[PDB]
Write a protein that binds this ligand. Sequence first.
Ligand SMILES: NC(=O)c1ccc[n+]([C@@H]2O[C@H](COP(=O)([O-])OP(=O)(O)OC[C@H]3O[C@@H](n4cnc5c(N)ncnc54)[C@H](O)[C@@H]3O)[C@@H](O)[C@H]2O)c1
Ligand SMILES: NC(=O)c1ccc[n+]([C@@H]2O[C@H](COP(=O)([O-])OP(=O)(O)OC[C@H]3O[C@@H](n4cnc5c(N)ncnc54)[C@H](O)[C@@H]3O)[C@@H](O)[C@H]2O)c1
Ligand SMILES: NC(=O)c1ccc[n+]([C@@H]2O[C@H](COP(=O)([O-])OP(=O)(O)OC[C@H]3O[C@@H](n4cnc5c(N)ncnc54)[C@H](O)[C@@H]3O)[C@@H](O)[C@H]2O)c1
Ligand SMILES: NC(=O)c1ccc[n+]([C@@H]2O[C@H](COP(=O)([O-])OP(=O)(O)OC[C@H]3O[C@@H](n4cnc5c(N)ncnc54)[C@H](O)[C@@H]3O)[C@@H](O)[C@H]2O)c1
Lengths: 249, 250, 249, 249
Amino acid sequence: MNLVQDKVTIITGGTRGIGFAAAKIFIDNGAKVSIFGETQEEVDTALAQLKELYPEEEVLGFAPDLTSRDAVMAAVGQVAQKYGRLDVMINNAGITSNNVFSRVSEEEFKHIMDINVTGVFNGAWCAYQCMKDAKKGVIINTASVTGIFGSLSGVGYPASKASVIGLTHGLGREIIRKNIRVVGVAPGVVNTDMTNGNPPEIMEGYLKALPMKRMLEPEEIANVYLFLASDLASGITATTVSVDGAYRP
Amino acid sequence: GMNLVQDKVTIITGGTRGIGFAAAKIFIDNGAKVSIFGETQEEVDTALAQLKELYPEEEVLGFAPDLTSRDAVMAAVGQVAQKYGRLDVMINNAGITSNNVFSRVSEEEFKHIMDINVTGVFNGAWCAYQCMKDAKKGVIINTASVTGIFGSLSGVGYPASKASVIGLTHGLGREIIRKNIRVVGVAPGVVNTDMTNGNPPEIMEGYLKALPMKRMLEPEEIANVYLFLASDLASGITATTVSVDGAYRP
Amino acid sequence: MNLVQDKVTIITGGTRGIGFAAAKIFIDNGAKVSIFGETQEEVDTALAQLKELYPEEEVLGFAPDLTSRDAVMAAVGQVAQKYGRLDVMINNAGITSNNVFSRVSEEEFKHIMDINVTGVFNGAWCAYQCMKDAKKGVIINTASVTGIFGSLSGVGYPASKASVIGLTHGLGREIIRKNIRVVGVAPGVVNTDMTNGNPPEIMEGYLKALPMKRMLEPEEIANVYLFLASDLASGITATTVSVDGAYRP
Amino acid sequence: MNLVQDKVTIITGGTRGIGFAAAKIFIDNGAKVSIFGETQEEVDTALAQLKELYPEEEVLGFAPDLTSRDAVMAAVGQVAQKYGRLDVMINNAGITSNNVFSRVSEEEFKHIMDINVTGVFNGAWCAYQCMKDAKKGVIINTASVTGIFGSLSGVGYPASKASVIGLTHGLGREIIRKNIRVVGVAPGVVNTDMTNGNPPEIMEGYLKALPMKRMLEPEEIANVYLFLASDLASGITATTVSVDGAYRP
Ligand SMILES: NC(=O)c1ccc[n+]([C@@H]2O[C@H](COP(=O)([O-])OP(=O)(O)OC[C@H]3O[C@@H](n4cnc5c(N)ncnc54)[C@H](O)[C@@H]3O)[C@@H](O)[C@H]2O)c1
Ligand SMILES: NC(=O)c1ccc[n+]([C@@H]2O[C@H](COP(=O)([O-])OP(=O)(O)OC[C@H]3O[C@@H](n4cnc5c(N)ncnc54)[C@H](O)[C@@H]3O)[C@@H](O)[C@H]2O)c1
Ligand SMILES: NC(=O)c1ccc[n+]([C@@H]2O[C@H](COP(=O)([O-])OP(=O)(O)OC[C@H]3O[C@@H](n4cnc5c(N)ncnc54)[C@H](O)[C@@H]3O)[C@@H](O)[C@H]2O)c1
Ligand SMILES: NC(=O)c1ccc[n+]([C@@H]2O[C@H](COP(=O)([O-])OP(=O)(O)OC[C@H]3O[C@@H](n4cnc5c(N)ncnc54)[C@H](O)[C@@H]3O)[C@@H](O)[C@H]2O)c1
């Protein structure tokens, strides 16, 4: 199976969790993969892990400030200049929130809006600049089940993830004439560092609320990134695919 | 090369032409054991002969049950389950459209589109569930439409029936996920099949140019989404409908 | 307050629950009200109740088979003939389902599809025929929260109520050029004969788990019918308004 | 008609357009109105216009930086101090975008996200702090049709307005236990300074694409704010009402 054969791919937040599982699955399927991480330390750790798994595969790693379009452009530009093209952009880096409304500070709301929305806008804009003249490409934006069904706390999380769905819808409709597809992915509860850090009572809570009686594995989200990036999904754009196993927050 | 549905016993309703027939081919290519349903025995015979030319060593069963009769659907689903010992995938793809102005929509026309597009999907999903529930495994795929989400400017029975399919998929998916059976919808935009061809090229030239992709989707582009959704790659996808419309808005 | 002053109104399922609460609120706001019921007995009971409340008000009552468009046309036609016009049509009559999928018979699925969807189509079609030449009117269709968020059982209920939302969207887009508005109302859990079952010991736990800690009252749905039928809602069409107090099935 | 009798109301962006039409309709319906505007000059102009219409009515006016929660709290706090309570908060201030994706600068995307989302979050948070102990109140957030159906350009506009819908959904579900309702309003194309200044070619396109063959008037949106703020809408929360006359971008 080589669903993304010879596709030049960038995965933001590709150092751990869903993004890292996607790096592996995309390399397994013939893609040329580059990853972004928050810090250079996280990037070095992930590149060393990928070097053990794939000793003959070259994987580029960068740590741009996702809130700065110039910093994202510098990193995206290096990938496009090394391979002469950019086929796939996955705006997967993201954070969550669970604070009760009264305890949501200005700083916390600004930060989740910055990373989850401005980070996605910057990545999609920089990918588009490298894809527009080639008149081909795929931009994948990671939303959440909370972007559709809301949440009971951490208002910045459904607000930012609903914005990602809205950005995906509008951008997809706008740039389809340049043969560039824009698709969203809205996961439910996934077994990563984002969810495994919670207290045991919250973990117990999730596991009883999940209709599948298990969290999804990062591979189950990464397999959807894989299909959506492949030419099999040539009819899918300006929409968000729910991958939540019927979980409802 | 690919074998995304290897050894999966699959039934495709409306598998004699358009999207369903393209799915029959793509599913056989990917290792599935395929059975098709068609509206008439003549359509079934034609499709089986076409598939026999393409795949001379492949056995494909064909049936023409009245989709509005659950006993007729159960008899056909039962024969497939009896022959292979299980049922892994059910695709409720058979459907029809409408474009009549509201004043000209007869009682008979509204009843018929509601019967085929909704009762036909309910009957197929119910009969599949009965053959899947003890195995605690399976995938049910229901074909909706872009009109089920964005409405239409005419033929009210078409968005009404296709929105019902999305609602059925959502509710059924939430209900039977505890039996490890996934229920997923597919909402196509405008697809190049017998459903959409008939108009002269002069009329169609301006229509195609106004489409966001400047072309209709091909039946293979919908069938490839059936393939992914039926595969173990979509293990996290249930109680939802995937839009495959190339940004087309009715 | 006379939000529907002199508006000739038909309310299907106006003999009890939401429909009956709407009959009272519409009479209070100056409308000329006619009600439909399943049986002649229900119609006689409701008309007598409205005579004790409003002795000087004339209310017409009919019991047409909602699955027969000719029977609905005969009743709608009599109202339009008596007042010379039809201003408001409320397709409020409906039923629910809670049977587990295996136990949903052909007959049960056919019946809920017939009453909840064909009944709404027939009422909307007959209203349209009496409104189209006047180039004014409002058609209100009662959906449900299950039409948007699904359900855990009784598949015919989300299937039929999602169809009502789809019919409302398509019909609204089609006939807005004739200055006829088509709007949906999606209630959550309302205190009527439809939810009047279980003893209080069992109910106490259920009510406590509801986001508002109570069901909605039929007046709370009828007040939304009132606004939507008024000229205040002149910009609202081809959409469904959620009146569920944040309840999620 | 006095749908919002004795209700202490704050309207952000109440100096012109929809917000100003709402100021008038809310005063007509018995509310105690306070307005916010971008500049002190706009506030002075609107207060003078309202003094000519209502010479005996006192209307407070403020121009806080909506991106600063402390500046919004200072203004909201003064209203709550003067009347001892806050009954209604309308987060109506907003801006639009129509730039092609390549021409959307970092600055433009940041600004629309700041005003349309952080401005709504700040207003809703400050209102909640003044409403939570009273265990009653209504927060109205202005989204847009583009938040549901996307757009063909100005990606910041559907992204920010979809975020407003997501914020409304999540916040509504979270604070309904404090008897505070959170509702959204999604207008189509409204005849205000936001749209009326466009070149004839763009105007022609709008008028052709509008199924009603006219734009909605600001009163048609303000009448929906009125109903949603009234006790008639007691069952409506954690949802967005479309007021678009079947217009689709
Ligand atoms: N884990 C879940 O249950 C869940 C639920 C729904 C949505 N999602 C979304 O899935 C995506 C991936 O999440 P995950 O669970 O794999 O998370 P993770 O914590 O396992 O990894 C997140 C990745 O994003 C990067 N990232 C985070 N904050 C960053 C910042 N400030 N700057 C730059 N990069 C940053 C990290 O470096 C890391 O590589 C996110 O968009 C998340 O919101 C996850
Ligand atoms: N083609 C499009 O533009 C379009 C758009 C949106 C939705 N869809 C949906 O896709 C599905 C497949 O459609 P298609 O375009 O391939 O159509 P098609 O006409 O090419 O084939 C339809 C198939 O369904 C079967 N079928 C139709 N009526 C039937 C009946 N009364 N009883 C039993 N079987 C019946 C036919 O035998 C045939 O095999 C349908 O559900 C259709 O509504 C298609
Ligand atoms: N009550 C709830 O919790 C709730 C929830 C969501 C949606 N709804 C919807 O609200 C609407 C009103 O329901 P309600 O709770 O007031 O119910 P109800 O049982 O109190 O009243 C139903 C009314 O519809 C009529 N009706 C029912 N079946 C009919 C048939 N076969 N033919 C003709 N008339 C028929 C009855 O005579 C009666 O007047 C329905 O469409 C229902 O689906 C109710
Ligand atoms: N007019 C339309 O076609 C339309 C379409 C859909 C949504 N909307 C939404 O409706 C709402 C009202 O818009 P309108 O058409 O009445 O606009 P308008 O331009 O007529 O008025 C906007 C108001 O918001 C204030 N405002 C704008 N930017 C601000 C800022 N930086 N800081 C503080 N206050 C600011 C202005 O002072 C003014 O009072 C907005 O949220 C807008 O996005 C309008």
